[PDB]
Design a protein around this ligand. Sequence first.
Ligand SMILES: Nc1ncnc2c1ncn2[C@@H]1O[C@@H]2COP(=O)(O)OP(=O)(O)OC[C@H]3O[C@@H](O[C@H]2[C@H]1O)[C@H](O)[C@@H]3O
Ligand SMILES: Nc1ncnc2c1ncn2[C@@H]1O[C@@H]2COP(=O)(O)OP(=O)(O)OC[C@H]3O[C@@H](O[C@H]2[C@H]1O)[C@H](O)[C@@H]3O
Lengths: 72, 72, 69, 69, 68, 69
Amino acid sequence: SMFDTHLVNQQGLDDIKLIKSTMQKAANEILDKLPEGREKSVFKTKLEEAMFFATKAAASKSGNYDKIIKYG
Amino acid sequence: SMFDTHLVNQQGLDDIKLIKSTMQKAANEILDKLPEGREKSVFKTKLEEAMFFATKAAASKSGNYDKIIKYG
Amino acid sequence: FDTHLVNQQGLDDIKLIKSTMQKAANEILDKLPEGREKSVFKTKLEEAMFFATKAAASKSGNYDKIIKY
Amino acid sequence: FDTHLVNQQGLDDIKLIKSTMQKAANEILDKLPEGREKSVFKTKLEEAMFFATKAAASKSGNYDKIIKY
Amino acid sequence: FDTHLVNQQGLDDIKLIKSTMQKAANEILDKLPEGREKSVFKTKLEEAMFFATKAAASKSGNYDKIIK
Amino acid sequence: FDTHLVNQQGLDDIKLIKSTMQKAANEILDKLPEGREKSVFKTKLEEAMFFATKAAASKSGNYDKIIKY
Ligand SMILES: Nc1ncnc2c1ncn2[C@@H]1O[C@@H]2COP(=O)(O)OP(=O)(O)OC[C@H]3O[C@@H](O[C@H]2[C@H]1O)[C@H](O)[C@@H]3O
Ligand SMILES: Nc1ncnc2c1ncn2[C@@H]1O[C@@H]2COP(=O)(O)OP(=O)(O)OC[C@H]3O[C@@H](O[C@H]2[C@H]1O)[C@H](O)[C@@H]3O
């Protein structure tokens, strides 16, 4: 279910650290080249949405969480 | 207008090369950590959307294009 | 891209918000015919829930730790 | 871009699904702090409900007419 | 999630905006190769038209009833 | 994130698609009241056009060069 909560373990946190640190560094380097304005701001908001899905893919990877809390 | 076409010059192409190669390296490193599945696929599609805005920000940066083609 | 590690209060707020939407989603989905529009509804709803869950998890009082990168 | 002209059952289904989502949204919103994430939750939910409402409106038996262009 | 039950004037405006966009979309689609970008163009356009149609339906004079 | 450098045929296809949508969009916008829905229509339409323009620029026979990264 889209509503499930994955209780991530350290392996999940480690994977998330790798992906977020990697994207953070790349995003800072790209943002430094872009002029302030609407397109730069939309790039940032679209990138934040993308990262919810990358983070969820890591958090729910077999071995990266200990238990799932389900609702209903 | 959202419909304007910026004819990029070499400085725009150089900026776009920097931003796209930076994101391609980061995306490949992140994708290598993610399990095959829907979330990985949505990450990629959201990231493609984000990059249209980063690329447009670079292409229309003052000094990065020579002329704008306008319609209507 | 901060990560918020929720405390018990954050977990309980997330229980409330996710339980509330899951119940409403079940009732609505059971009324909708199968097909493209029902699928897209679920896609958009999941996107909404990422933002609601982040709002709850990053609310002051709801996290033990913020991890920055 | 079909235009659905719903009949009485279509209006009833849409009333149920929108009433159900409005109640759940209100309960969730009361738990969320003001800010960007809460605002995006609302906008995503509005997108979701366009598709749920289209699904209901074009359900067999729920329309007087579907106008095509 | 307000509902607008349009009157004839709202239905006429909606016919004009949707007919206009459908004609333009068909002309553009006839130029585009099959594939992912063409498919996403269509779904993005459907999303856009939900908002255009709601703007027209809630225009003063275009609705007979608002249901809350 | 390949970059397509259009040739003349790609530029002329882009002229056709962008001038067609700009005229339609102007006609529609002139019917719409100012407000949030009109604003989101424009934002969603811009997103649509990135994909249509990319589809045209990478169509076989419409590009001089593809830059890969
Ligand atoms: N062992 C844990 N101990 C403590 N806290 C944990 C653990 N494991 C996970 N968490 C966090 O709780 C929430 C989980 O709820 P969820 O339904 O599974 O995640 P989500 O839907 O993708 O929401 C997206 C947002 O939630 C925020 O906190 C998430 C998790 O980071 C994120 O920062 C996202 O920004
Ligand atoms: N005088 C009317 N008589 C009968 N039916 C009417 C009238 N006037 C409007 N309608 C229809 O009611 C439904 C709910 O309206 P709503 O709640 O305002 O719509 P929405 O949130 O914008 O989603 C919109 C999606 O629903 C479909 O049917 C819509 C309206 O076309 C749309 O085709 C979209 O696919």
